[model samples]
Structures are given as structure tokens and as C-alpha cells.
Target: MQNTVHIDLSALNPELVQAVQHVVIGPSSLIVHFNEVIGRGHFGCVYHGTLLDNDGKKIHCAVKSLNRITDIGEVSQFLTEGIIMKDFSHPNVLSLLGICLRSEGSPLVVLPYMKHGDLRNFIRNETHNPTVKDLIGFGLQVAKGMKYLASKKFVHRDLAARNCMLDEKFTVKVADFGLPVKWMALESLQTQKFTTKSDVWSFGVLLWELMTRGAPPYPDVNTFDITVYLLQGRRLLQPEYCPDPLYEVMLKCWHPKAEMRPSFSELVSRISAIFSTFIGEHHHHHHH
Candidate 1:
């Protein structure tokens, strides 16, 4: 589950330290090994790492590095927005701890970890069955955050609660990360080209995942066969808790005509309305 850390002084090339555009961290602070590997997918293994707070306290972060690109010349293409990520700020979007510049080993990107972990886990093992307000609020969080993400030029080939982490206060953080074949939209399957709208399509399925408590989308349909199902106008069924109006919104998301789908910008406004109407008016403890 976890790959522990290894130490080598040469792994830390001090010469590259000044070249580190983002804040340089790790080496002196990283634990003997990570807590464990949380994901093994595109961009290689993402591990749960702990970095000391300089005061020797601990901070857990999602760690990934230059597994895909090996050449030092590739750093520009590699860190397309590493500089932007460090300076970027938003409530719903995840922030970074810093980068570990290593000419000896993989150059690592350290990300802040959320207490609740991924939203898929959070939704599936919900502490309390979520009220509609809670559910819509979650959607609103993703919608608004992803809007900020889109402005920053992230196509987000993957957009699911599994990819979205929740901070302690339950804010959805749009973490950088997949091509996820299963989350593909109609056009996404046909055209390899990806757009923010492509992400809007995946977001629709993510909404279904939330509605269904983290169950796999198109469970009966095979990923190999999903292209058939989606192209044939078949879509995901409504969940036990999802309302018709809300489901209808999801329906438009992957509508066969890819040009017809609403943007995350559009989604933010609409879900905002749904969130407001559904927020108040019911509570427990009024019982006799």
C-alpha cells in the first residue's frame, strides 16, 4: 500500500535549488517514507507524504513527480503551470505546499491534503445521510471551483468526486490530475480532443456518482461497451435521492449534441439557484 522513503544526499542537488521557481521544500522535512500510495494512474504514483512544518510538526500532502518527463529540457512543458499553481488561490481549488527539485530523482510536486480525503469516499461513507441541501451544496462547490479552474485553462480531462478532495470545512478542491475512459462524453469518445466542455461532460457523471453514493457509473455497461451505450442516447439512471429537475440538468450535460451542453460557468449559476431554494426550512429536535 505504501512505498517508504529513501535518503541520499545526492538526490538533493542544491544547485537546482535557486532555479526552483516555486518555493523549494521536502528534503530536510520529508519522512523516512510516505504514509502510502493513494493513487497509481496517469502521472505515475501519487503518495501520501508528510513534510515537517519547519518546527518539526507534520503536514500531509499528495505527492507526485516527473515520472512522465525525464529530460531536464522538458521542465517547461512539464511544469506548464507549476508557477501559476503556486501563485493561484481559490477556496474550491486545491493549493500546493511546494516542489522538491531533484536532479537525482523524480522532481516532486507536494499538494496540501484535505482532512475528509476524496469526495467519493466521503459520499459513500457519509457521516450522516446527506440532505438535498447538502448534496446541492457539494455540487455548487465543485461547479464554482471548476469555473475558476477553467479560467486558469485547465481542460481537466478527469472530473469526478474521486478526483475532487474535500477540505476540513467541506470545500471541494479541484486538484490537478486523468483521461478516465469511463468518464468520457459522447464527443469526448469520438474526438480525442479535450475541452473544458469535455470536463463538463465528466462532471455530469461525477454528479451521478455523488447522487448514487460513489457507485461506478454505467455499472451494467462495460467501459468497452459504454461508447455504444452513450452514442445510442442511453444515459445514467437517476439516483434514489436525485430530483427530476436536477437529473434533467445532468441530462443536458451529455446531450448527444455536444455543442448543446452547458458550460461549468453556466452550471455555477443554475446550481446556485438550486442550492439557494434547497438550503433552509427543515431541522430535527422539533419533535415532542
Candidate 2:
């Protein structure tokens, strides 16, 4: 018996439906060849591949293949992620080109190739030190992307440096919606509830990662103890080189109360302002 995937078109925007091309995989359709495994995680594996674009041009793309479906709920959620990807058309958000279904009922999600890979690895292996502007610019970019998601009433249950990818131009695009409990908000930890403010909390941890060149959040604390630690009001310390203003932002995001966190829109404005302040101070210091 052939297991068919079903999606609720009514739940998706019409434009999104028009934009996505559903390709049935078989000898009749164009063949997609996977070249290399670019990434692997708890939910799926991402591979480098070549596929025909909407214009009929063959192009390089990243193909994400889901793990074997074990239940109907998993299938529904995977399709829901597909719906989210279809309508998420933003520069700083990873765009979904389309989906390809294999003969055996497996699905392959196609995304644009991001040459630089993920932000965490990029920063960790950065040979040259990033200027304050460069660091804040990256934060601003992610904030803008998250802001867009918030405006659409969508929550990025997982938002972190590792989940953010960089293009050849070093542009950041938020990615990786799989496996989020490790970086979840306190409320999410307690109730399995996620919200935009929960995303804000992760963004704070991501900022910490950026400042520390991709250090794991709460390095000294054990994973099992993180929930209790946060509940006790113990948050990540300011990295050695993190600016006071930026660290303050991180603190706000770590507030026990989700309502105390800044919205992505406000976060972008605050980070931009912080960048400007540092730039101005740098100019003054160099002037003398």
C-alpha cells in the first residue's frame, strides 16, 4: 500500500500554494541526485543536491530528508512545518523552494544553497576577529527575521546560532526547526508551551553564543540542572568581551517572566542602536 501525504491547503495562503511546486519522484519526473551530507540532527538529514528550478535551470540546493515516519502525528507536524516554510518568504529566513516526494513515500524538502553553512560554526572558526559592528549586524539580521515571523503570528520554537545559516555574502538566514527542547524557554520547559517570547529567550542565548564565538550555553552547568538553574534566576554570565548594553539585552531576555522580554521588533531596534553607539565610540577613540 502506498502511503500518501496530505496537506490542508485551506490553512495555507493561496500565494504560498501557488509558489510551491509539488514534484512526484519516479522515473517519469526529473531525478534529484544527492551529492553530500551537509548536516544531520535528531529530526532529519540535510544533503547537498542539484535540482531544476522554476525557470527550468539546474541549480545547487540543499535537500533535507526527514527520518522515517513512525506515526501519523509526526506526518502531520512535518507537513505543518512545510506549510510554515511555504509562506516564509524573507531574506533572513530560509526559504523553501518546494517539496519532492519519493516513490516509497519519503519526502525531500528543497532549500536554497547557503555557501557559508551555519552561523555558529562560522563564528567559531572565524580566523579574524569580528568587529563590534559585524557582531551586532549579525544579531540585527536575526532579529529582523524573527520579527517577520512574529508579525505572521508564527513562533520559531528553535532559534539559535547553530540554527542560523550564512550565505556566501555572510548574510544570516534563520533555519533548523527540529529538536528544540535544549534551548527552550523556562515556561516551555515546564509546560511544553512555546511562544514568540520563548523565541526571544533563545535569541538571548544565541547572543551569548555570538559574543563567545559559539560557546555552548551554560557551559559549567549540567543539562539536567539548567531548568532549575534558570528558575533560581541564575543566567549566563556576560562574555569577557560583550558590551554592557548588549549584555543587558541578554539579561532582559533571560528574565523569568516571558512578558519582560523585548519583542523581535524592539530587539532589532535596540541592537541597531547599540551598534551605532559602539561605532560612534570607536570613531571617537580613533580620532584621538
Candidate 3:
């Protein structure tokens, strides 16, 4: 065998990434020092990095690295992301800047790294038990992104708190298009397994995660038992630490049938209406 060398990062495996899902990115690859790891995923890790243009101007971007050798699903997931990213055109969505392959010809995805982390972590780390108004504002931004996806007939089936990012301006960016799809050889069977309604469903679960501060659905209860309880139209009690009416919205989103759930357009309206009430109540308390 040829002599082993780490030059050009050929010797760096995907497993070399840090536990929080960083350490895979650096200034050497795209020419910027990687800051901190804000978020991560199963197939790869994300880091905050910077890039300089040919004219010497620079801009910050998120660097995503996938382990080509270890994960069997990486290739297919990368393919799906490429397809979606190429076709995607949405203002509320984070734009994909470019893609790169590892020195060993591995896959790398580059995007605009939001200065702030994802919505899930924001609620957990930055905010101290936020009020319902905060939830409404954030949810509306997510719904706007989802509605844009629906207009293009794309379904972000795996919509959740972790998949949504927040920038310095508090704008929401929806991402993570890595999911399974069955390509149809026949035109008749080309039905999209991912649907607009499903995205709405995910949005609801995301709301739940936000209100509960990233709790695992029900921390105190057994997983299987909780599933059984929800199946009977009985929801696990809302986090005592949360506001009251906000809990009802979560249960509504967890409705069994997708068709029965609110669409993104509808959700936007609902959140606006709800936020108005929450603000009024908050202001009233300060007055008396």
C-alpha cells in the first residue's frame, strides 16, 4: 500500500468530527477558521465558517461534512439534498451556496450558517422559559417557510425544532431535506410520499418541542405508554412550566389525521390571532 498521509485531509475520517457535530470544518478547506459547532445531524456535522470571494470580499457560511466511508445512507441522502437544493427558491429558506467533495472524493455541503443556532436550541439555551407570544412569532415564521414549500409542491416531512434555524434578525430558516424517497420508473406511481400536510404536522410537533423546552414528548412517562395515551385522544399533560392556552395548540397539531390538521396558511393566521390575545393579556397584567 502507498504511504498514509493526512495532507489534504485524506486521512481525516468523518468519525473525526466533534460530539456536538463539529470539528470537521476549518479554514483550510474553504479558507476560513471554523468558529463553534452550533448544530449537527446523524449523517454529518455543521460548523460556522467563512469564505472569501475572488475579489477578496468575505462572507460567512455553514460547512456540512458527511462521513462517506461509514454511513451507507450518506450517498442517497446527499443525492436528495442536491435535487432539492438545486430546485429550491424560497425567501424564508436558507439558500445553499455550494457543495464540495472530500480529498478522498467524499461529499461536503455548504450553506449560509446562521449566526444564531436552531430554534430548538435557542429556546433551550438563550431564552428563559419564553412566553406564548414568543412561540407565536417563531411559529409564524416557520409556517411562512412551510407555506412557500407547499406552493412549490415540496413537503418537508421531517419538520421539527432542530431542523429550523434562526438568524440574528430572528428570521426562521427551514432546512434538512435529507429523507428517503422511492423514485418511480412508471409515471402513474410517481406519488409524493412527502406531502404539504405532513410538513404542517411536523410544524405542530415542533411547536410542542418549543413550548416544552426540548423535552422528549414525555420525560416522566414510558415511551410506549405515552403513545397509547395519545392514541386515545388524551395528551400527555403540558409542561407545568409552560403557559396554559399554548398547550391546546400543541394537542391540536397532534391530531391523528393529516387532513384534519391546519394547513401552513391556516397556521399562520392562527398564530397571529393567538399572539394578539397573548400580548393583550400580558399588557393587562402590567396595568393592574
Candidate 4:
């Protein structure tokens, strides 16, 4: 027996619902041919797949198949989470192409394929000589994405270099959901709660990663000691090449009090001011 799930488009704006395709997919409607294993985690495995769309044309896509779960409630919860991404529309946010349920007992989320993969590996291996301007540009793109999320009152509990993917043009798009405890906000660590400010804290760590060309945050600190370290007012040290102004912004995001952390809007404004000169040059090149 095939089960059908109804899409709650009413939860999204009318225009948003019209802008994207949402449906209850059956077994035969979607076909996925795996190419390479792009990413793997406790949740499941992400694979590069060639999908046949409604028009019967093949397109490269990233297929995320969740790990097996026998509980019907757990499966429904995962599907519900995937549905939320359907309405997300932003240049710097990954687009959810579609979802499949009948393919397996679990859900399969289809997304556009990013040629460059995640920002962490891209910066570490592909961008050997990234200038300071490049780092700032990356930060701005991520902030833009987060700003959109914040506007919708969505709190990204997980924000990190690995969760941010780079496209063919090296544009950054925030991806990966339900992050591990390691990337969570301090408040989230203790109370098991999350808010927009928690995202700000994670964004700060992303900036640190960008500055260090993808170095792990708090390299010497043990995971178990993170809570105590934060309570003692300890934080990640400035990356050797990070600018003083940028470092200052990072510090604000790492403020122990979530209320004290700067919002994503404020972060975008500060970063724009710091890189106004570079942004101008960037615009000039595009104009020609």
C-alpha cells in the first residue's frame, strides 16, 4: 500500500507557493541514479544523482536519502522538515528541487548540484590563494542568506563552513540541516533551545573558519570542555590573518549573552561597510 502526504502550502505565502513545485511523490514518479557519494553523516548519505524531471529530461542533482527509521512518527517528522525547504527562495540559499517518499520507507530530498561542494573544502583545497577580499565576499553571501532566514523567524540551529556550499561560480549557499551538537549555540548546548541569536553565534564561527582558510574552531579545546570554556569567557582566538575590524565583529557574535550578540542584519551592515571598496570594484567588473 502506498501512503500519500499532503503538502501544506498554506503555511507559505501565496507567491512562494506558486514559485516552487510541491507534491507528494510516488515510487515510479521519481528515479535516482547515483554517481558519487558527495557527503555522509549520521543522518544519511548525500549522493550525486541524475534525475528525470516531469519533462522527462535528465538533470544533475544532489539526492539526500535519510538513514532508515522504523518509527512512523520519526519518518513523518523528517518529511515535515524537508517540506519547509520547498518554500525557501534565495540566491544564497540552496533550492529544494523536490521530495520523494515512495522510493523508500524514508524521504529523499532533491536539491540542485553544487559543483564546488561545501565552503570548507572549497576554501581549504581549491582556494589556496584567496585574498582578504574573497573571504569578506564569502561572509557577505552567507549573511545575506541568514538575513532571509531571520526575516522568516527561522533559526538555523546549525551554521558552519561545512554546511555552506559553493556553486560553480563559487557563490556560497547555506545547506545542511539538523547539525551536530558541536556546531550548536552555547544556549542551545545547555538548554537544548535555539533562536536567531544562536545562529549569530554560529555565523561568528563560520567567519573564523573563513579567516583561517577552514581551520577547525577552538583547535586545542576538547568538545566536552566547550561549555566550561564558554562559561569562563573563553572564545576562539583571532585567526592570524584576520583583520582587526572583522575580528571585532566576530567577538560581538561570540558574546556570552545571546541578547548581546549582533543580529544578522547588523552583521551584514558592518561587513558591507568594511568591504564597501571591494564591493564597488565587484560591481564595476559585473557592469562591464
lDDT of 1 by residue, 10-105 (tens): 333454433455477757776524447767766556788888996879887777654455444444434443444565688877787777755455
lDDT by residue (1-288, candidate 3, tens digit) is: 111211233333353222113313333447423456645666566777677755767778877765334433554455346435555666567767666544454455678868667778777874445555666667767778887788787767667777788766667788875321111011111334556765655676677776677766555655435445555666546766455666676666656666777777777777766666664322111100
Query: Lowest-lDDT window of 10 residues in candidate 2?
Result: 279-288
Comparing 3 and 4 by TM-score, which wins? 4
Alpha carbon lDDT at 123, candidate 2: 83
Worst 10 residues of 4 by lDDT: 279-288
Q: What is the TM-score of candidate 2? A: 0.81
RMSD to truth, every model? 6.2, 5.5, 8.9, 5.3
Question: All candidates' TM-scores?
Answer: 0.77, 0.81, 0.71, 0.81
- Clash list (residue pairs), candidate 1: 5-33
Tens-place lDDT digits, model 2, residues 196-261: 999999999888888888888776777777789888888888888789999999999878899988
Measured on C-alpha atoms, candidate 1 has an lDDT of 0.71
lDDT of each: 0.71, 0.75, 0.59, 0.75
For model 3, state the Cα shift of residue 268 in Å: 0.7
lDDT of 3 at 24: 30
* Model 3 misplaced regions, further than 4 Å: 1-29, 32-42, 68-73, 126-129, 178-194, 220-227, 239-246, 280-288
Candidate 1, residue 214: lDDT: 85
